[PDB]
Amino acid sequence: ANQALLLSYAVNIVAALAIIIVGLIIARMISNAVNRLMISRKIDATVADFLSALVRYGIIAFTLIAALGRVGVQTASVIAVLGAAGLAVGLALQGSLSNLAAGVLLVMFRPFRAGEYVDLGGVAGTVLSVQIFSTTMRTADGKIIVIPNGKIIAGNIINFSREPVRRNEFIIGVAYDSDIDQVKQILTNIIQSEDRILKDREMTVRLNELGASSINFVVRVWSNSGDLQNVYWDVLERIKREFDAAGISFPYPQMDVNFKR
Amino acid sequence: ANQALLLSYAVNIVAALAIIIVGLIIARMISNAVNRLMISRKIDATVADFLSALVRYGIIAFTLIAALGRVGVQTASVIAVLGAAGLAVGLALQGSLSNLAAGVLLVMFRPFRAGEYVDLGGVAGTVLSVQIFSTTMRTADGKIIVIPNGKIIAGNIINFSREPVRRNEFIIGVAYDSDIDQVKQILTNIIQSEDRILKDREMTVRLNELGASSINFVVRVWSNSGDLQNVYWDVLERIKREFDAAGISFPYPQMDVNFKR
Amino acid sequence: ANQALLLSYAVNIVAALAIIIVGLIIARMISNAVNRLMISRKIDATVADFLSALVRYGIIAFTLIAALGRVGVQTASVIAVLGAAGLAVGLALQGSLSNLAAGVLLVMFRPFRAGEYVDLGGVAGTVLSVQIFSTTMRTADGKIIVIPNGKIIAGNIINFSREPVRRNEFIIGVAYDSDIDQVKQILTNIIQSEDRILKDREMTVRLNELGASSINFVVRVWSNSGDLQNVYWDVLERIKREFDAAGISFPYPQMDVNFKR
Amino acid sequence: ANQALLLSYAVNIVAALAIIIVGLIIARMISNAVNRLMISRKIDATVADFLSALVRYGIIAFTLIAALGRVGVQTASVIAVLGAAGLAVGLALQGSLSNLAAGVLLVMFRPFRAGEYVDLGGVAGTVLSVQIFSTTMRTADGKIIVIPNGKIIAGNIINFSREPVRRNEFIIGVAYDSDIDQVKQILTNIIQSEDRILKDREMTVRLNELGASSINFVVRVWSNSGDLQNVYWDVLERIKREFDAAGISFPYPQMDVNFKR
Amino acid sequence: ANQALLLSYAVNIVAALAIIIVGLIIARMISNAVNRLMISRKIDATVADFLSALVRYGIIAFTLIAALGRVGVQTASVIAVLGAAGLAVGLALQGSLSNLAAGVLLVMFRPFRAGEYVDLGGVAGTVLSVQIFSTTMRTADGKIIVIPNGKIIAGNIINFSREPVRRNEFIIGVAYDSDIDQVKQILTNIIQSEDRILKDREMTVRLNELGASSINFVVRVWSNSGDLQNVYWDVLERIKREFDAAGISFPYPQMDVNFKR
Amino acid sequence: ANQALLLSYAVNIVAALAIIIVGLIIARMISNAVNRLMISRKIDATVADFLSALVRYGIIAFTLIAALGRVGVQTASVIAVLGAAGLAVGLALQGSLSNLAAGVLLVMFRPFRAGEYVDLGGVAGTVLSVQIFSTTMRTADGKIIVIPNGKIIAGNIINFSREPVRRNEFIIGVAYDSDIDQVKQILTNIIQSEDRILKDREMTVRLNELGASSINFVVRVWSNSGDLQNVYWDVLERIKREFDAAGISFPYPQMDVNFKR
Amino acid sequence: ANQALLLSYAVNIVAALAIIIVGLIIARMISNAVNRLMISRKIDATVADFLSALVRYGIIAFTLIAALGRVGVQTASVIAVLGAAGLAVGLALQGSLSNLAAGVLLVMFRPFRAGEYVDLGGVAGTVLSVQIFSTTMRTADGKIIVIPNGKIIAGNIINFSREPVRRNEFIIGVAYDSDIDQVKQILTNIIQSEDRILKDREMTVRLNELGASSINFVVRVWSNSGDLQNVYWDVLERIKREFDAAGISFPYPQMDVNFKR
Structure with a gap:
């Protein structure tokens, strides 16, 4: 007969159900939008499907734990496990992101440019192009060498053709x-x-x-x-x-x- | 005779019991679902059993500590220990996840492809296939070399057959x-x-x-x-x-x- | 004469005493169960006693700090110290857990199998078995070499007998x-x-x-x-x-x- | 004249004083107990005194900051500094704890045993004993070599006497x-x-x-x-x-x- | 008919809408300001667009999660994921920021100056200039070498021309x-x-x-x-x-x- | 005219002022005590002054942010920055603390003692003394070598004079x-x-x-x-x-x- | 017409405005004080301006997020991003701070002194002075070598002139x-x-x-x-x-x- 207890519990359960259904609908819609955008441009099918599945799983997990917390069940352990997983993923992607950052720095500073004979850590050749993750250079013998940008930023960068x-x-x-x-x-x-x-x-x-x-x-x-x-x-x-x-x-x-x- | 104290305690204990039994039932059902799905496709028996046991233990631990917190016992130490264990597991799996990320990047960028003579960090041979974790290449002498993808992304990638x-x-x-x-x-x-x-x-x-x-x-x-x-x-x-x-x-x-x- | 103050303090102290005694009893019972289970199967006496002592100490510490927090004394410093200790233990066990993960990956992928002549990082021989932490292989001279699985996953894995x-x-x-x-x-x-x-x-x-x-x-x-x-x-x-x-x-x-x- | 303000402040100050005096007494008693136990068995005087001083300082710091928080002064900065110090200590002790874990693994798995001619990372000799932190082996020339267990787990472990x-x-x-x-x-x-x-x-x-x-x-x-x-x-x-x-x-x-x- | 429930919910939803629209407007205005400032001076078009997109995405994400929290949906998982992403970005940029710090230290201390014959880790030549991230020096043969400042701070710095x-x-x-x-x-x-x-x-x-x-x-x-x-x-x-x-x-x-x- | 608002604000401001003045007085007194104790025994003037200045700055910062939080201004950013600074200091002191821990372990275990001919990582000589951070040994040629204890714990420790x-x-x-x-x-x-x-x-x-x-x-x-x-x-x-x-x-x-x- | 709602909102907005204006004034005054102090003594113009700009930006960011939190907008994401940035800065400055700590230890212990012929990691010469970050020594050929103090603490320190x-x-x-x-x-x-x-x-x-x-x-x-x-x-x-x-x-x-x- 209490005016606050039953009313509050009904409000909590209705709000939790609304939150979870809204989150699921938003996750489905955003997955549709992201897959439409990725198909509309250059993308790889299997990798794109894997990334879409991972992002949808993350969003639905967020919605589920938010609904559980609104219900009243503590989710601190799940939050800690998600944080540990995020730290593991970050440590895994440290190498790739460091390569990307090194490539951005190389593009901005331009220590070397296309058609310039260089020596990047013991290998010498003419630079063809500098992509986001790795550069491409052709040795004098004609062999193509692809070097990660992190290994270029670390260590010396000798430029033969800079000085006339x-x-x-x-x-x-x-x-x-x-x-x-x-x-x-x-x-x-x-x-x-x-x-x-x-x-x-x-x-x-x-x-x-x-x-x-x-x-x-x-x-x-x-x-x-x-x-x-x-x-x-x-x-x-x-x-x-x-x-x-x-x-x-x-x-x-x-x-x-x-x-x- | 208080209308709030005994009622609140009864509600708390009943809710905690309901939460723990619901969590145990959900853990059993999800273990059944995951083992059915893993048996229905390619899987290793012992590793699959180990993973199922670990995930069931994690879920039941989450439910137990949530019920304890609902009862009113602080679980901050258990949360911290779970976070430390998660960080340890992430540091352990850093190598494998870095290899997986390197393999994904190699598949997406395609620095080398099957049937192309390459030189990945001192070993030369024809590339057969590039899997998720490690590639397979055959040396000119006929020896099969399996290289982790992280060791390929790190260091130079010489491609002999790219240039005609x-x-x-x-x-x-x-x-x-x-x-x-x-x-x-x-x-x-x-x-x-x-x-x-x-x-x-x-x-x-x-x-x-x-x-x-x-x-x-x-x-x-x-x-x-x-x-x-x-x-x-x-x-x-x-x-x-x-x-x-x-x-x-x-x-x-x-x-x-x-x-x- | 207040109806809430003394009653609340009595409830708090009684609940704290009940929590600590229940936790101690549960810790004793779980130590009994775990030592019974470990004795019933293969185990080392001294290492098993050390692990049981550590887990019992951890559980009783959790119960004690939970009771202290229920009493009303802040335990944030103890929680932080426990987290630092957990991080130290995780960093210490990083090597062993990485070896275990590498062994699991090697078992699942099967880059090499028993009775196959391989070359794992400079040492060549016939593989006898692949355990969880380290493999066993016999050199052509007859020497037994035990290699950690992490050192196998890192670096090349040359297989002589894969190709006929x-x-x-x-x-x-x-x-x-x-x-x-x-x-x-x-x-x-x-x-x-x-x-x-x-x-x-x-x-x-x-x-x-x-x-x-x-x-x-x-x-x-x-x-x-x-x-x-x-x-x-x-x-x-x-x-x-x-x-x-x-x-x-x-x-x-x-x-x-x-x-x- | 307020019935809650002055009463609450008096309760807070009395409880804080009781908490700090109880904590100091418990710290003194536990220091007495631990030094009695350590003197009763094998221990080093200076190292034992240093450890007892550190643990007593930690306990009294915990009690002092708990009393300060009960008074009402925020201790978040002190907690953060204690966490940073704990992380520093853990990073410092990472090497020793890794050696201990490697020794435990070596004892459990028994890759080598006493009186067995081995080769642990370039040095060959007969194993005498395997302690918790480091093993002892005698070279053929008669020189005694003490190797940390971490350096044994990392790298190959060649056993000459395993195969007859x-x-x-x-x-x-x-x-x-x-x-x-x-x-x-x-x-x-x-x-x-x-x-x-x-x-x-x-x-x-x-x-x-x-x-x-x-x-x-x-x-x-x-x-x-x-x-x-x-x-x-x-x-x-x-x-x-x-x-x-x-x-x-x-x-x-x-x-x-x-x-x- | 309750005077607090419906009024509070209306206030919450109106405040959340106001917060999100204000945040979006502020994000648009700050993006306009930052792009105006960056175009007004030296900048790279593609890198500047990438940075502006990232900062606008970060700001709008902050506003969205703040509005969600004001509504009442827990955002702890999103906060943890953002923290993990920030830690990953920091680990990635560790190398570049370390190079920047080393360059600042080199500029402040002036171990070497322009036109002074030095030997920075095995390569000898005359120093031309010391930039923020990397220095430029000309070898006696006339080759230009660009060395990251971190690799200069680490290791010896031999100065031939300091002593007459x-x-x-x-x-x-x-x-x-x-x-x-x-x-x-x-x-x-x-x-x-x-x-x-x-x-x-x-x-x-x-x-x-x-x-x-x-x-x-x-x-x-x-x-x-x-x-x-x-x-x-x-x-x-x-x-x-x-x-x-x-x-x-x-x-x-x-x-x-x-x-x- | 409200009995709670103005009274509470006055109490808050008075308590904050009392807290900050008490903290400043305690910081001055503890700085006086610590400098008296350090002067009374062996200490270096400049390093001691630097350490006293740092500890006084830390204490006054703690008091200031505690007073600010009592006033009602959030200090979470300052706490996070202090934690980051503490982590940086811990990472910096990792080497020194690891050396100290290695020295403590060497003193406790006594792998070698004074007047015993040893070989610590390629350098051979008679051990003179083992200090907290580094040992001192004299080569057969008469040269004095000081080795950090971490570099001794890592790697082999050959003892020539242990076996008669x-x-x-x-x-x-x-x-x-x-x-x-x-x-x-x-x-x-x-x-x-x-x-x-x-x-x-x-x-x-x-x-x-x-x-x-x-x-x-x-x-x-x-x-x-x-x-x-x-x-x-x-x-x-x-x-x-x-x-x-x-x-x-x-x-x-x-x-x-x-x-x- | 409510006596608490509108009054509380007005108090909150007025307090937030007062906090932000006070913080901005304090930031301007402290920037003036710090630049006056740094100009009054030895300092570099560009580096000093950069540091002053960074510290002023940090202080104003702290004040802005504190005002936002007082208003009622959650700032947890901003706090997490600031913590990630602080961790990145700490990882970047790890090398410099480790060098500083090594220099402090070298000054305190005095393993070597000015005018003493030493050998610090393969390079031999007479020590001139030991600064905070790096020492200066002159080789027998007359070349000046500047060595970071971290590279001196790590590895052996041979002293030729200690023994007569x-x-x-x-x-x-x-x-x-x-x-x-x-x-x-x-x-x-x-x-x-x-x-x-x-x-x-x-x-x-x-x-x-x-x-x-x-x-x-x-x-x-x-x-x-x-x-x-x-x-x-x-x-x-x-x-x-x-x-x-x-x-x-x-x-x-x-x-x-x-x-x-």
Whole structure:
């Protein structure tokens, strides 16, 4: 006969039923909307169905536990389990989301761009495109390498083509008895004769070290990045020919034997 | 004689009993439904029984603590322990869920497909299929390698067969006294004579470096990926035969001895 | 003389005492039940006693803090400390639970089975059994290796015996002056003479590379996995005998000396 | 003159004082009990005093913040700081607790037992005992190695003495001109003459590879683990003596010189 | 006919509608303001649109769940899921934010500055600029290297140009029979003759070690960082010339043969 | 004119002011007490001032937010920020606290003690003392090494001096033509003649392997740890002298040349 | 006409407006105070402006959400997002705070001090100063190395200059035919003749091992750390001179050839 008890219980049960039916209808409608939108554009059938099933399950679970709490049954354990599952999913997706964030940062900063020869953590090649999750680059041999963006952000990013001017380095080995002045002036003449070698930059021709069987001269020349290999090959061939003509001989690994008995 | 105290306590105890019995019945029914569904399709008996036991235990624990809270006993410690257990389970399953997410990403993006020769972190072979957790690929020797998808997403993904055109590289060593013009023109004629070598692409025949005992010429030719090994073998054999015929000798490791005593 | 204050305090203290005594009795009864069940089956005495003591301590702590909260003393700090302890225990057991999950996944997917020659992260051998936490495999030398399942799921899983057909690879070194046609046809005849070598599969006999002191021919033959070692040994012995008979000599590491003085 | 305000405040302050004094008395009594129990058995004085001080500080802090909350001052910041400290302590003790859990798992599963020759992550020796935190093993040289149990659970666990039968492997190098039939039959006779070599198991005597300066025969024999070293030494000595008697000479590293000038 | 029930429900529904419409209007206005501000300055179109969409979605979700809670439907599960998503996003952005923090610390402390030759974890070059996320440095060869600031803070930071004075080290190998006093005094005279070598600092010329085929003298000289390479090259060339003039011969790798047969 | 509204607001504001002033006074008094206690014993001035400032700031922040909450302003955001800061501090101090815990475990278990020759992760030396955070040990060369206790608990702990008896191992190389019986009996006589070599333990003198240029005999002798180096040196010198006297010659690296041309 | 509803709503809205305006004024005043204090001392302009903007944004956000909660709109989602952001910031700053804590520990314990030659994880040099985040040390070559304090606390800390006495080690190689007594007594006389070598410490001159081509004597001498290099060089030079005078010859890498054909 109480005016508050039975009335309150009836209100609670009616409100819980209304909440659960409204939530189920909204879940069905939102699943319909999301699947319509995903089919209307590019999507994968199986993955899309899996995602739609997961989101519908999540929404209906939310509605069910909300209705249970409105009824009066504590749902703290279910909330804690859902939080643990969410933390597990977040830890699982940490790698993919980190790759996505690294890709966004790479797009915004533009450390490298398409058609630029780079070196991303030990692999060198021309960059084709930079997608959201991973980039695509072609090695000089023609192999395609796909690198996750996280592994690019972590570690060095060497860019060969950013600077128009790069330097070559020659290691020329001649015999000990060879005339140092003669070899130095021959190398200097060879360097001067070339035109693709920049002249305003330093052109060092010095004795680098005293090796085990030969003395190594270091020759450093700067040139535009577009002619580096060609100038290196031409200078090396000219050095070989000029040393052959001038009598300077490249020494083979030399050892001396103290004969006994 | 109070109208609220005894009535409220009776309502609380009756509601708690109703909640616990309803929860137990629902747990039994849902266990029956889930085991029927899992038996009706592919499943493993022992693992399925373990999972059903765990889910039934979780549901009955939820119902019991909800009934205890309705009675009036605080369950915050039990909730915290359940949350800690959930976090432990999530940390344990982090690896498996990360592998699953990586597999989903690989399926969606399709960096590689079945029947495509790839190199996933140091191991090369033809891809057979890409499952949810791990892929299957066959090495050239015929060994089957199963790689977790997380270890594929992390690190480089080299695709040999994506580009139809790849480049070969030859390292040919000849003696110092050999005629550079003669060897270069012989190699050029050998390269020209072949038809499987693409002609629009660069075909470099230059002196690469001055080695310890020999001078190494670098020969680079581009060809379709389907004939790379065959063209390499044919060019190498032709180089051997032509150098033998023309008198150019491949030098053995050469050293000179300064005899004493 | 108040009808609510003293009555409420008496109800609170009586309810707290009832709750704590009921919890203690239930803890004793559940400890009795769990120890009876664990003794009735396989269990370790000391570990079982430790686990029973820990679970009884946890239950009595839950009951005590619930009674304290019913009395009216805040237990939030105790709850937080229990949560921190649970998180510590979960972090500690992360490794063991990850191993268990990996074992469950391995059992369900069956990447490898008993009596199958595999290679799990650098160690090769025949699989004996796959338990919940770790597998057991016997090396070819007869050593027993026990590997945690987490270390198996992480990293590659090479299966030698999955494919019935595998390929052998020979590296045969002959002298430079040897007749290439003669050695190639001799190797071809040796390969043809064998019956265990599959004929529908490719049988390549080509010149692989020009080594420092010898030219290495690559011979590749496919055969059933059950005869791989035997066919390799037989082919190698036949190659040795035929090269000895035909006059082709395997060259020792060859160097030439430019004598001086 | 209000009947509820002053009465409620007096009740609150009296209850807070009673709670704090009861908590302090209980903390003193429990510290007395725990130190009596720890002194009555094996314990370290300084570490025990440190632990008792920490637990007493924790209990008195709990009581103080409970009394403050009963008074009416919010303690949420103190609770959060205590939770952060607990998480820090848990992260610190993660290593020790993981070692303890690994030790418990090792005791329960018994991958290895006392007096069994094992190899735990690169170090080999006889196991003496397995404690809760770390095991003790003696190397063949006599050095004692103590390994944490976590580092044992992580990584492989090789057990030499689990299988009664193990296999030896011989690498015998003879000259190229040596008679293959003669050396094979000599090795076969040597193997047959021994009794400690199991005869039901495979006994392979084949040509393994063509080395740089010698041909290596592979001899594999199975025997009980208790005679492995002895049978290896005896077979090796017999091989040496028989090859010396039969004229087969073990070749030194052989090279040939092409003399010039 | 109740004066509180219907009135309270009407107030709740009207307040919820007002809250949701106000939140939607505020979200639209703040999106307009933020996009106006971002367009007015430097920004990327696609990334800016993505960020604006995400922030608008977050704000509207906040408003919707606030309205739902005002209505009376529990939103604890939605709150937990949002917290899990936030934790996942934080774990994903941990790398980028750590790089930003490292960059801020590097800017504040200034371990290195523009135009200063450094060595950041194995790569050496001149620093160009230090941005928020990553620095830019040019190698001596002319290659541009972009290093994340986190990888710079972690690990050593070697600064070559901080100290104006650096030391060179020479390893000179002479024959065993050479006169130690003569070579030491020759090296001392060579060191004294130079002017770019600092004289107040130590100038050690001692016998370092007895090598396999030569005795190595260690010569250490200090000089300004601006002349280090030049002084090294000049001293080395002078050492070569003076040893050639004085008769001391640099020994080749020397071995002695005990001829037999 | 309301008897509850204005009275309640006045009570709230007065209580908040009393709480904040009491908290400030208590913070000042506790800072005075803690600085008096820290000055009265060993402490560092700057670090102590920093810690006192931090603890006073924390206490005053707690009091301020408690007063704000008593006033009625929600402090949930401040609580969350304080929790995040506490978690950051805990993650930062994880390393130091782990080192402290490892040190406590090392002190309690005593794997090694002062004056005992050990090998903690690749570095060997005599232990001087074990502090709370790091141990101190002196290398045989006299260098002092300080190792964090965490790096000691992680990884192996080799104890040389725990076992009084250790084993030496000799690798003696003799020529192929040497008499095996003669060399074995000579080594046996040398071993027997020594007194510091334990006789009850095994003393193996066997042919270990057939090397490239020599046959290596393995000689194993057990002795007390206090005479290991001395017995090794004495046995080696005696072996040299006896082999010189008996005509057995230690062979140099031997190769044979097949002279051509 | 209700006396509680409209009055309560007016009180709520007025209190919310007062709270938000007070919070904004306090935020402006505290920003003014903090920027005045930071400008009055050493600070960086851009970083200081960034920090002031962040702290002002945080304070105004706190005030806004507090006002919203006072109004009655739930802010749980905003609180959760703020907590997630705080956790992300803490994870980002974990490295910097760990470095700071390690620096504090290093300052307090003083494992090394200024002007003391140390070796911190592979790099050796003299310590200049130890700052809060990173130390500064100068290598013997003169290069400045800045090491984060976390990388110093982790791993070994070798201190060369802590012990005044250190030991040198000589490896002297003589020919097999050399007289062992003669070389030992010569080395003993050389050691005795020096005065900087401590005599109370052990001075071992023994035969260490039988090398491939020479017998290596080990000479160990202890001396003060201030004369280690000088005594080493002097002893080595004296050894060379005395062996040259006494006829003992240091052997070159010796091999013997078995001539054939």
